[PDB]
Amino acid sequence: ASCTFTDAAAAIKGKASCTSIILNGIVVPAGTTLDMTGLKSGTTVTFQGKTTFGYKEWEGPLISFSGTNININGASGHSIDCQGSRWWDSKGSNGGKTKPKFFYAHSLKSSNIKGLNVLNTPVQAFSINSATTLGVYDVIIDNSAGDSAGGHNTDAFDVGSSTGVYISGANVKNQDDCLAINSGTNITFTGGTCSGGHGLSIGSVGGRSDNTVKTVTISNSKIVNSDNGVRIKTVSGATGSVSGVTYSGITLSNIAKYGIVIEQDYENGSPTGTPTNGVPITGLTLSKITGSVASSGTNVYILCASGACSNWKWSGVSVTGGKKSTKCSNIPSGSGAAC
Numbered sequence: 569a570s571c572t573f574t575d576a577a578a579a580i581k582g583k584a585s586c587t588s589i590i591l592n593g594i595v596v597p598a599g600t601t602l603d604m605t606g607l608k609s610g611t612t613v614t615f616q617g618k619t620t621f622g623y624k625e626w627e628g629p630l631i632s633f634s635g636t637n638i639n640i641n642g643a644s645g646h647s648i649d650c651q652g653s654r655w656w657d658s659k660g661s662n663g664g665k666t667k668p669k670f671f672y673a674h675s676l677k678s679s680n681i682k683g684l685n686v687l688n689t690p691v692q693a694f695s696i697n698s699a700t701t702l703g704v705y706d707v708i709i710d711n712s713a714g715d716s717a718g719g720h721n722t723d724a725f726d727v728g729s730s731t732g733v734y735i736s737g738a739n740v741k742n743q744d745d746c747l748a749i750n751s752g753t754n755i756t757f758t759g760g761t762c763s764g765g766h767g768l769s770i771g772s773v774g775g776r777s778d779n780t781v782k783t784v785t786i787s788n789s790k791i792v793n794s795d796n797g798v799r800i801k802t803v804s805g806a807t808g809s810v811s812g813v814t815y816s817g818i819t820l821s822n823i824a825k826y827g828i829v830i831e832q833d834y835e836n837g838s839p840t841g842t843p844t845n846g847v848p849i850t851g852l853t854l855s856k857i858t859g860s861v862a863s864s865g866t867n868v869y870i871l872c873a874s875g876a877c878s879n880w881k882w883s884g885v886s887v888t889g890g891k892k893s894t895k896c897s898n899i900p901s902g903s904g905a906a907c
């Protein structure tokens with residue numbers, strides 16, 4: 569590589585002069601970002617050894633990348649260990665200590681992240697925002713320690729205001745969404761394994777600067793020991809759009825709350841029981857969605873406002889083991905969808 573750094577400030581000072589960078593065993597000073605924004609176009613950046621971070625109660629990000637034609641890779645043996653248990657307090661980003669976001673994959677164009685091995689994020693892991701064609705391959709996010717040490721709001725991939733995001737072969741163990749797409753166009757999640765969290769989610773959609781989800785493929789993935797399997801949420805009273813979404817080849821195991829949940833009634837982060845019509849869900853395909861829900865959970869819950877869900881196609885959906893909801897509303901007729 570042009571440049572190998574074991575020091576965070578040296579790396580930040582020198583980055584734009586390096587065509588290839590190795591970040592080797594960096595201890596990132598407490599309360600600071602490993603700031604890899606503004607890279608020279610075409611730069612490759614490789615993590616080696618164990619990256620760690622000083623402790624401070626602050627908002628992060630711990631790491632930040634931006635640029636065009638950037639490749640962000642992990643070397644054999646590397647890890648990025650945030651030692652999140654230092655912050656974890658069962659309250660996540662909703663109270664207790666101020667806890668830093670981990671990785672800002674922001675303003676990355678025609679770029680790729682491959683093979684990053686991430687452990688113990690304080691709260692959310694990857695924030696993907698203002699990205700234009702970004703591959704995210706074979707990323708491992710292991711927040712399993714958080715199950716018994718107070719992990720909360722440890723989402724793996726949060727996506728907004730982005731296009732052409734392609735997440736492939738992710739392996740996630742956490743306590744919140746495996747995926748949350750709040751907005752974006754041409755977003756893929758495929759070949760993934762999601763354990764311990766809240767499933768593969770669209771939304772909540774609405775009430776943000778960007779409320780459009782269009783052309784999404786979430787496929788060939790396993791969801792295990794999670795609250796939800798397939799999830800789409802839209803915000804009560806909001807305007808937006810969820811269209812051209814396909815979930816296919818999704819296996820579910822021991823889902824606690826909902827195998828499939830689609831509801832248009834989110835207000836301040838909680839369902840109201842009353843759906844609203846300003847964020848229509850159209851062109852929704854579910855194909856080959858199979859598996860088990862806990863007896864105390866619910867197989868399928870569809871809570872559409874009148875006229876607000878249409879052009880759905882569901883086939884090979886076999887979700888069993890939980891209760892059958894008596895509360896579903898306005899399911900697209902003839903779609904094959906059923907609670």
Ligand SMILES: *[C@@H]1O[C@H](CO)[C@@H](O[C@@H]2O[C@H](CO)[C@@H](O[C@@H]3O[C@H](CO[C@H]4O[C@H](CO[C@H]5O[C@H](CO)[C@@H](O)[C@H](O)[C@@H]5O)[C@@H](O)[C@H](O)[C@@H]4O)[C@@H](O)[C@H](O[C@H]4O[C@H](CO)[C@@H](O)[C@H](O)[C@@H]4O)[C@@H]3O)[C@H](O)[C@H]2NC(C)=O)[C@H](O)[C@H]1NC(C)=O
Binds near residue numbers: 637701731733734754
């Ligand atoms: C919706 O989102 C998706 C996901 O982001 C968008 O799909 C992505 O689009 C981008 C372009 O914007 C693609 O990047 C390009 O990929 C081209 C093809 O790459 C692959 O093929 C290469 C060649 O394959 C063969 O050769 C190799 C040996 O060379 C063999 O080993 C192999 O078996 C094949 O026989 C592979 O080498 C490579 O690893 C990929 O598998 C590239 O050719 C292209 O590179 C061009 O530009 C580069 C400058 O950045 C330059 O270096 C190159 O020379 C070349 O000019 C570029 O990387 C993504 O691959 C693609 N991702 C996926 C998953 O599809 C999609 O476009 C978007 N939809 C819309 C409507 O926008």
